[PDB]
Amino acid sequence: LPEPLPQGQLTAY
Amino acid sequence: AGVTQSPTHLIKTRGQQVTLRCSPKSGHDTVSWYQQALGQGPQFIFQYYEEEERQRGNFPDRFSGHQFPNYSSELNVNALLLGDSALYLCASSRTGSTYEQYFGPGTRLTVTEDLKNVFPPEVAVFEPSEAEISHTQKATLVCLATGFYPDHVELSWWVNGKEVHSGVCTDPQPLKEQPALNDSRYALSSRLRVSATFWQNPRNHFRCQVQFYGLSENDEWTQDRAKPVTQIVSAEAWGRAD
Amino acid sequence: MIQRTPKIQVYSRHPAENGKSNFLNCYVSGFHPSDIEVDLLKNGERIEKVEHSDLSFSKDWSFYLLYYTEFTPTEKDEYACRVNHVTLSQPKIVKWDRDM
Amino acid sequence: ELKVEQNPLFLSMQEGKNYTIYCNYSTTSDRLYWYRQDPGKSLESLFVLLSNGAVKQEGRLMASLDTKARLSTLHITAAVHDLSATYFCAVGGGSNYQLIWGAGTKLIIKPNIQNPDPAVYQLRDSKSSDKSVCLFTDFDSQTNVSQSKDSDVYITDKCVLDMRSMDFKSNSAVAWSNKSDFACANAFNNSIIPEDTFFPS
Amino acid sequence: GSHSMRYFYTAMSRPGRGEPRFIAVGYVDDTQFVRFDSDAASPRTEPRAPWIEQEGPEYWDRNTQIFKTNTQTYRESLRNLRGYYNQSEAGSHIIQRMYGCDLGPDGRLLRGHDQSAYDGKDYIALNEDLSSWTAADTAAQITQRKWEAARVAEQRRAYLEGLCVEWLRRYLENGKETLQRADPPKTHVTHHPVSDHEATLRCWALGFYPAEITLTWQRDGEDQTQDTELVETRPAGDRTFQKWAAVVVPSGEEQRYTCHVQHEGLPKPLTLRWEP
Ligand SMILES: [Mg+2]
Ligand SMILES: [Mg+2]
Ligand code: NA
């Protein structure tokens, strides 16, 4: 199972 | 915004049809539909995602659903059976996220043989006893909402035009007035306890308010009694000094 | 930047037996960047029914792919793999040696 | 195949005390939820447990997941009346959208009555010489209110009110009958009540 | 053991030829089980192992949505790295990331991993303790801070210690038939003369699972490390692997030579030699 999206926005590099 | 549902209630007869609306919590894209019967755990109807019915539970074709491009949904139930009476609930979640699933307030469906079964409540309040006041220095107002069908009511206490929660206690379940029949009307009691000194001030106003979820303006009515529409039935009382 | 040239391996799944159905593989690995053109040739002509694995990388971050096809080895038929990368001035063709 | 069973179906508890309710499930859990439902209300989310050894605590509630035992437990600490509701357990398996729900565990948190003053009082309708209503109040939480033999007599179950400001809690039961035969003194007969209960007049 | 789960993400920018492509693949051990390619008509996570097909509708929606969201975020990440390095709008770049878990006793995490590379060079890694990072350079330090600020290591740790390790055992249970059976190498030594004076000895190892293997040529019980040709372990396409070790030997001296095979499927190590 891949890591689930956080409740908020996904943090970039 | 959180999970929303519309309508509040529906009172139908067999063979009729209904549609119910749900809007997911902002950020949620998938919606769940559950049927909950009296003293029962929710039962899965279907899940909609990307406007498609993703999975279905043990529900027939008369249970049909829709999902709009804005993630909002609809649950249509046709050829209504007396057994379809339930709390129809919607839950939403954000796909590929943290697994939270929130529910809407639910739509209370009642499928009855005939609309003649629908009755609004009679509300009455009863004033504190001299004895209670003298013996406890406390005062209890009792409010009775009687003779209503269906069991869709919201009782609230209003002291000085403001809703109170403190010192209140409403029955969690109504009484069947005719415990023997299936179309029995209900009775419900509530208590509001105040200090004797508060009841003793006649400038203090008490109102018990019962919201009934009854018939729509659109429902046909043929009975020689007021159409039992959604309405508020209240009973008021001023404090006494004695 | 870091530009790594692909290492090529041309082989069969099972030991090659003339007249017997098998699989012809070309394993392109050790490359970087990801863009690669890979072809399997039967007597110099490209095999049309050619499938490949999904893009993945090794511990050193270099990519690897598998290009494969159903095939029947014969005594006369020559099989090869033709590969093109940015690191290559022109395509690199490797003949399939059945003993390797 | 995925079956969810909660236990007990109902739990009687004293405020201030600690209790544990259980959720057993039969097949591999993808998700295990704990929901709360108040009477005539919808489902409030409490917890989602996703993997073995997960423990989540929110206020007086703590949920743990044991995937080896295929059990989840909900701990209620320093129980307060407000925690009284039906607590549900829902499980999802096989990466299906369909959650199987437990039949729920009704939590009845009873108050500890410091100075029981059991009494039956008569209340009058502000409006008329109706109906009128009898009130059983101030008794300890271990008093069980029973339904009447008479079908024309109506008795509500015991209810807890909280005079939050005064830090005071009390139990009450309400009785009424249209029949003029009915009287306050006979109302709570058929129920086992204290005997020091006060009957004014 | 140890069993493992790894997800491999490849984000590649391509100026003028469209928006960055995102590829994700999933592995349990050495078996790929999923794929996602943003270049498809309607990108959908696809099953790549038989044992993953059983998963219900939710698994597909979840995987697709994670990958579709990561695609957008990887476009953004690529623009950031371009900027950190003051890079041309014309050049094509690649962010790679490998993350996953090693299964320890009691089904608990034995080891967590999360690593990233810019254009094939180590960029940012999550440390063995799962709370810290090692930035390869100054640009990676900007990332390090973005992540420390967003408490990313704690989020990633929760996944590795929980969801990841739970989902790995599951997959291992569903596919115990193949994932839990180690296929030993089928081995033989071939002889190929080179001249009147020399001959090639090739030690073959075919059809083994998983890929980890050691093929060693030994002359008189002494490692031929110096002159042994070794091919990269290569896939046979049936989910198994192939490898050969070759050495040029003096003609008539072939019996001094021995091949050593170390594999997980092999109860004891193999001592192999040419039997004409
Ligand atoms: Mg790596
Ligand atoms: Mg070229
Ligand atoms: Na190319």
Numbering used by the authors:
A (entry chain C): 1 to 13
B (entry chain E): 2 to 29, 37 to 58, 63 to 72, 74 to 81, 83 to 256
C (entry chain B): 0 to 99
D (entry chain D): 1 to 29, 37 to 59, 63 to 68, 74 to 216
E (entry chain A): 1 to 276
Which statements did the authors publish about this structure?
We compared the binding modes of three distinct human TCRs, CA5, SB27, and SB47, complexed with a “super-bulged” viral peptide (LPEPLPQGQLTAY) restricted by HLA-B*35:08. The recognition of a 13-amino acid (aa) determinant (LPEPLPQGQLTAY, termed “LPEP”) from Epstein-Barr virus, restricted by HLA-B*35:08, represents a well described example of how the T-cell repertoire, isolated from Epstein-Barr virus+ individuals, responds to a bulged pHLA-I epitope. Clonally distributed αβ T-cell receptors (TCRs)8 on CD8+ cytotoxic T lymphocytes (CTLs) specifically recognize peptide (p) fragments, generally between 8 and 10 amino acids in length, presented by major histocompatibility complex class I (MHC-I) molecules expressed on the surface of all nucleated cells. Here, we provide structural and mechanistic data to explain how both closely related and distinct TCRs can interact with a “super-bulged” peptide presented by HLA-I.
